[model samples]
Target: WDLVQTLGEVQLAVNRVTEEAVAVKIVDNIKKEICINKMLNHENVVKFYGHRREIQYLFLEYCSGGELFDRIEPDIGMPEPDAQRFFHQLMAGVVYLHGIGITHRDIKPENLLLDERDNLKISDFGLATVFRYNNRERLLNKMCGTLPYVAPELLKRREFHAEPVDVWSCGIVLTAMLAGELPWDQPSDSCQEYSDWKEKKTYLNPWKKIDSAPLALLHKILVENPSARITIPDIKKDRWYNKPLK
Candidate 1:
């Protein structure tokens, strides 16, 4: 395989024989990333091809459109229809993972890649883990994921339900897609923006700028109380999400 470009821990490479592009995730240990990603089979999820044990390399489907973060322009987000398209794909992947009892602890625009067709593909499963066994649900104690996208419950340093945690991150991701920036540095008391949000100050910059439809959905998903946060099924039923894409 020939190297294309370096993407943090992952390297873009192309196969010499078939001339197929792939993302090479180089890690000291591939057990966690490989185990979690190999079984996932969804159109919105990045496809995991195979791995090489010699140098601990994970072969993954290459996304030509790059990270979803690159699609947004700082304070100026993408068009509504475009945002809706990507958000829909994101939710589709999230719902599938949750349905199978797996929780993607780290979900952010940086972790979301776009293929040639602009299809959003959820990537980076190093922090992912199983949160359910049979019909029993488990609460995760470890605090993981990006700061801005991390749920409030995770910052509280307490045991948190896995599903709601991902829901909260999804809310942040959606907000970034629509508003072009994160609501705050972190969803904690120290961040004044977050504190204002917690106080129901809807007149804030991003919140005030967002349209009512998506803003309502964000409100339901970004709840400080994880248990009170909207579920994937409910999000699918949300009027804004189900609205026709232009």
Candidate 2:
């Protein structure tokens, strides 16, 4: 494989044999990422072809379109049609992971990649873990993921349900796609934006910028109460989410 570039722990390479681009993730401990990636099989999720255990290298599908973060225009966002399309693909991947008992703790723009065809692909499973087993749900204790995209409950420093957290992060990701920036640095009371949001200040900068349809869905997904948070099925059925992209 010929090296293309290095992205922190991952390296971009081109396989000489197949002349195909691939991502190589170098890890000291490959159990979590490798095991989790092995279970994933979705067009919206990055593919894991194989791994070399001796050198701790994991070969993954290369996304030439790069991170979704690069597409966002910082406070200006992208076209609504583009945002809607990407959001649809993102939700599809999230639903697939949740259905199989896995939860992606980190669901930010930087972790979301795009293929040459601009299809959203969820990546980076180092922070991911199983949230369910044998039809039973498990509570997660670790406080992981980026601050801006983390669920509010995670700041309480207590064990929390996994699914809602992912949903909350998804809401944040959508917000970023629409508004081109995060609503706050964190979801706690310490951040004035979050406090205003908690107090029903919907007329704020980013919130006000989003269309009413998506804003409503964001409200449901970003709820402080995990139990009241919107589920994958509900999001799929939302009018805005199902609307034909114009």
Candidate 3:
């Protein structure tokens, strides 16, 4: 399917009737974004051109470039520079969401869409929830998303904050980008291995022999204790991302 150009502030229709804006998850957060967070108009956050109920319409810009998962290859992952740009942009997206008291409970590569120029867009606000405080995890509820990328507090079904979850998911995304395996999806057979992985004991396999940067960053992001977890700014300044050193 081709994306037709929609001019100005009008929402583009998905099919013949309603216009398609981000992802299918718009059914959940659209109303809240319009009604509650009425003042949300950040650069990185998904722009709300408009909406439609009976037409099932969510008029907005179409992200035609596709998902990040569509590109993560095995031997030849994205170049370090390209990956760094993506990481920086993703951090911007998260920061935008945080600025508006929103948490994209599901922030996987699958939900991240790109434009014609391959600029990243945060889509699928369905699984996300809004929290009032900018810095607290107490705002998020009902952990949802692909299991491996989900935060440990969510896995444990514990009442948790939002920033920590975002940071954790960021680490997972980086791991998937570099390692080509689900770090959390460890145990092929034993519960002990799964338990150990979830507990953050050991996460490397000589059989896989992946690189170390993603794994190292993953440790800080995947820590069970939210307090000990790496914050977003730290990740943004990570040496791997400091300069375009591909």
Candidate 4:
């Protein structure tokens, strides 16, 4: 077995038999029996192949466009329309996951892969879980994922729902994709940018960090109160998000 790149917890390998690329993750057969039998058909998700023993393998799709982070880093950010294009594709993947009762706990630019067609694919479902929510605000207790991209509910160390957590991260990722910088810090104390955003509310025009049109959309998605945070379905309904790409 030759060594290859690792994405999150999944290890990449080149198949000597066919010269094809595959991603593998080893889970305890008894400890962690996965239920990913249904997610294989999702277009925006990586293709899942058969598994043997503790190792689960997936066919490596053409993600030659590389990670979304690499795309956003070079320009200090991308244009609003371009960012919207990527975000739209991401939301589609998210909506599909949520509809199927799976929650991708870690949603960030780094976890997002772009294919040769420039379409975004949601990758690295290592932190994902299959939960059945009894109510609209059902909580999945746990704190995980990158700092600055986590929801405030997680930071508060309280019972938190899955969909909203993903939504908050989407807001952060969208902003970072557009501005190439985080609007607030982890603890967020004494950060002038945080202070300004708080005082100004929704629209932070003074620092000139983001544009007015998209900032309005982020305002709805980045609510500190998870109850008020926009859901994935609602996110797709936003006019700005639905607008045609330029």
Candidate 5:
């Protein structure tokens, strides 16, 4: 590992503020997230570490699952049953997050970690925002998450709902797990066409289709209308999502 240390010149107590460097939002969000992570301990969610406010530092636990996307193969993606199992775990994580009034803005495969037992762990809360505050859900118009995972409402550059966006991204990730490739990452004819495809509902995404797929979850996820798009709960209830179907 590449290493850089200024230990001799600086004391941790005194250099905590000066030597520390992290994304502004990451530091800001970490301050608020630590308490929640500590409060909730689950198998799906990644463990959050306490922060160093004086030095603006956050120490998060290491994710050994590498990444969900990295586990995919280039051709003939994971079987439907395997995808089903992975997504079921993913949905459970979302359910737990929503229960506590948290909306994970970034729900892409990269943020989903797989442990030694291949258990899913949600990571990267830099853009995550608490939806439930004072017993109310916030509008969450902050409008910042990974680009491909960004929902139609977010793509329209309008103030919609953040939770829907989170759910939308999860659906996209699920589709990728099934296809071994992300819709936005596919080879498009042109940049304009790709942008057009992203917001449209009727067209077929190369990686997913109603006929060959025999799974319409991606359809609901990539819907043209935000209101009509599926939710975390929707995916959980889908028939195809039930693994071990005989």
Candidate 6:
């Protein structure tokens, strides 16, 4: 016996005999990506089952808790402690991906999901790829991903190391989760809004300036100059990141 339910772009199907439900996604150019996700075994990343057919197909873990994007919005930011917990999980997935030599070029709230137990799972690898040159890790040149999360180098159309790009997007998502909004409107610091926000404290500010512990880590990760940005391991090592949620 079998049953199926449609959820946005993907379909959720269940084997009635076994009561096991799984997600299915179909695409044309992502056959390779689908197989890659299947091999990527990590708690924080989506579990992939297999694929089939002409156009393309994907069987994924069914995340019943829903998208992180649905959980956080500008007017409804997550509690700092909760944000840290979620961010930690996100970083774990990212660090794992980088460890395996794959760059998840797209890292955003919408691409993150939560399981019934609220464990975070990184999804959507359509823009992901292995960054290498002559069998050595190297800079990539693709200005891809959502506007708000895209790195400054990608916006400037300059060649950039891939791992940092993912890190930068994570920084933005972290801010959005904690502050209820992003610190800036654009990828670059040329924007007057970011400059004003950085220089003077405003009534709308959710947290204080450069010296605050939590905010300081955010500043390091969200640096416009990717070369100066903090890595995922650095984030794990930070005291603020390890602070208890309570």
Q: How many residue pairs collide in each prediction?
A: 0, 0, 9, 0, 2, 0
In model 5, where do residues sit more than 4 Å from their true spots? 1-28, 53-57, 185-205, 208-214, 243-246
Candidate closer to the true structure by lDDT (higher is better), 2 or 4? 2
Indicate the residue-level lDDT of 75 in model 3. Answer: 45
Better structure of 2 and 3 per TM-score: 2
Pairs of residues at least 3 apart in sequence or in different chains that clash in candidate 1: none
Model 1 scores a C-alpha lDDT of: 0.88
lDDT of 1 at 58: 86
Q: Which residue pairs does candidate 3 place in steric collision?
A: 11-59, 12-19, 13-19, 13-20, 14-18, 14-19, 14-20, 137-161, 137-162
| Alpha-carbon lDDT, every model | 0.88, 0.90, 0.64, 0.72, 0.64, 0.79
Q: What tens digits encode model 5's per-residue C-alpha lDDT throughout 139-161?
A: 76676777767775675644676
Per-model TM values vs. the true structure:
0.95, 0.96, 0.76, 0.82, 0.75, 0.90
Please list the residue runs of candidate 3 whose C-alpha ends up more than 4 Å from where it truly belongs after superposition.
Answer: 1-30, 33-39, 74-76, 133-137, 186-210
Model 6 residue runs over 4 Å out of place are 1-3, 132-135, 197-211
Clashing pairs in 4: none
Task: Kindly report which residue stretches of model 4 are placed more than 4 angstroms away from their true locations once superposed.
Answer: 1-12, 25-34, 37-40, 54-62, 133-138, 187-192, 201-207
Candidate 1 lDDT by residue in tens digits, 16-128: 89988888988771587788887799999999888888858888888989999999988978888898888889889998999998998899988899999999999888889
TM-score of candidate 4 relative to the true fold: 0.82
What lDDT score is found at residue 242 in candidate 1? 84
TM-score-better candidate, 3 vs 6: 6
Worst 10 residues of 6 by lDDT: 202-211
Highest lDDT: give the candidate number: 2
For model 2, residues 1-246, the per-residue Cα lDDT tens digits are 988899657889887898888999887715888899999999999999999877588899999999999999999888888999999999899999999999989999999999999999999888899999999999999889999999988988579999899999999999999998899999988889999998889898899899998898988888998889999899999989988878
